Amino acid sequence: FQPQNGQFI
Amino acid sequence: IQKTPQIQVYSRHPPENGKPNILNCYVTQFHPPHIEIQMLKNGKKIPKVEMSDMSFSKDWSFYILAHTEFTPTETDTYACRVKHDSMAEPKTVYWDRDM
Amino acid sequence: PHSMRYFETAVSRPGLEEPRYISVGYVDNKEFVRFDSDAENPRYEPRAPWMEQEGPEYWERETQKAKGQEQWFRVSLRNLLGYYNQSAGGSHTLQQMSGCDLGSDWRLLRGYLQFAYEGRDYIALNEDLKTWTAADMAAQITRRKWEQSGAAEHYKAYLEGECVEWLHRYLKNGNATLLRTDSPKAHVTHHPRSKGEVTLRCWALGFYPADITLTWQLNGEELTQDMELVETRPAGDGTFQKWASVVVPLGKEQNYTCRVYHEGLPEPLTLRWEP
């Protein structure tokens, strides 16, 4: 289950 | 931000002159992912070389498996030539039947 | 003692052509799913026979998330360009590793979430799942940015939730498969060298998983003294090989034994040179 990232770096 | 790749050249099955087999070129510990690997026969580039998909291990470095069909003989020499940005010149490693 | 990880990579290339994004999933260190933006029709693809079970819905959902990830790396990749003062026309790499480990009890034991840029640690989420460990100055900008926005909480939820729910699921589907083994088949070869002295090499082929132990002994004594040992290597068919050798005094050859230890063997192996 691919995780979906939060705020960009 | 480079890493100099390690190379191992070996057959999939124990060699037997005349018996078809698969020759391997396992490249590891390199970065960035772009790289050019060539497999040679008596100094000539082998056109039909399969390449595993790009993977990287826990220390961020990448590894790949290049292989091709070959039929060892008493006379033919096989080698792997790796072209990567972390080296100012390509590195060539020969297939050694005893390794 | 199971786990699941997603190893993601985004590499920028010379020009105004969007970077290539590659994402690979693992269960107990075995690749089970893969996505590549270079491919013809980019979609998430099965990579272990036990994943073909999932219907269309699953692959569609996964494919979308991955397309979002690709965009996220596109953006993040530009910001890094600034952080480090790099011209907009070079070669760069941003990588991420995320996942969870389950303990004996199958409960979350630890979650992971780290990034690297140009091959080096950039910022990692700590075991507490709330505080960050930036690797350098540049990374501080990002850490400050993420603290000042509760970015940690977002991952914590995934790591203790979906990560765990789906790992349990995948483990159920690929139960016996994942927990399989192929014993190694060994043999010893003899090779000349030094005047008198000679080389004996013990081979282990066709085994899975890659974990294995090769030992050499002289008169029942661990000869951990000058033994040649290559890194374990993939054969290409999904099995592995590894070999160890020693330089021995000619004639005194049959005075040495090779012992092979592997998780798939009913019992360890012992073998000697056989002229």
Lookup: tokens for C251: 């004639």
Beta bridge partners of C101: C3, C110
Between the CA of residue C251 and those of B86, C203, C244, what are the distances in Å? 46, 21, 20
Please answer whether residues C5 and C112 qualify as being in contact, where contact means their C-beta atoms are separated by less than 8 angstroms: yes
Q: What is the resolution in angstroms?
A: 2.2
Q: Obtained via which technique?
A: X-ray
- As a whole number of angstroms, the distance between CA C111 and CA B17 comes to 51
- In CATH terms, the fold of domain B1-99 is Immunoglobulin-like (2.60.40)
Selected from 3.90.1150.10, 3.30.500.10, 3.30.1360.70, 3.40.50.300, the CATH number assigned to the domain covering C1-180 reads 3.30.500.10
Residues in chain B: 99
Q: Where are the domains of chain C?
A: 1-180, 181-270
Chain pair A-C, CB pairs under 8 angstroms: 52
Alpha-carbon gap: A3 to the closest alpha carbon of chain C (Å): 7
- As a whole number of angstroms, the distance between CA C170 and CA C188 comes to 40
Q: How many other C-beta atoms can be found within 10 angstroms of the C-beta atom of residue C31?
A: 14
C95 contacts: CB under 8 Å, gap ≥ 6: B56, B60, C7, C8, C9, C10, C115, C116, C117
B70, with CB counted inside 10 A (0-12, 13-18, 19+), is buried
CATH superfamily for domain C181-270: Immunoglobulins (2.60.40.10)
Lookup: tokens for C51: 């994943």
Among B9, B54, B67, B97, most C C-beta atoms within 10 A, so best to mutate, is B54
Q: How many other C-beta atoms can be found within 10 angstroms of the C-beta atom of residue B79?
A: 18
C55 contacts: CB under 8 Å, gap ≥ 6: none
With vertex at residue C239, the alpha carbon angle to CA C39 and CA B3, rounded to the nearest 5 degrees, is: 60
Lookup: tokens for C68: 């979002």
Exposure on the CB side of residue C113, measured as CA atoms within 13 A: 26
Q: Do C123 and A9 touch (CB under 8 A)?
A: yes
Chain pair B-C, CB pairs under 8 angstroms: 70
Q: Where are the domains of chain B?
A: 1-99
Among candidate residues B76, B61, B79, the one with its CA nearest the CA of residue B23: B79
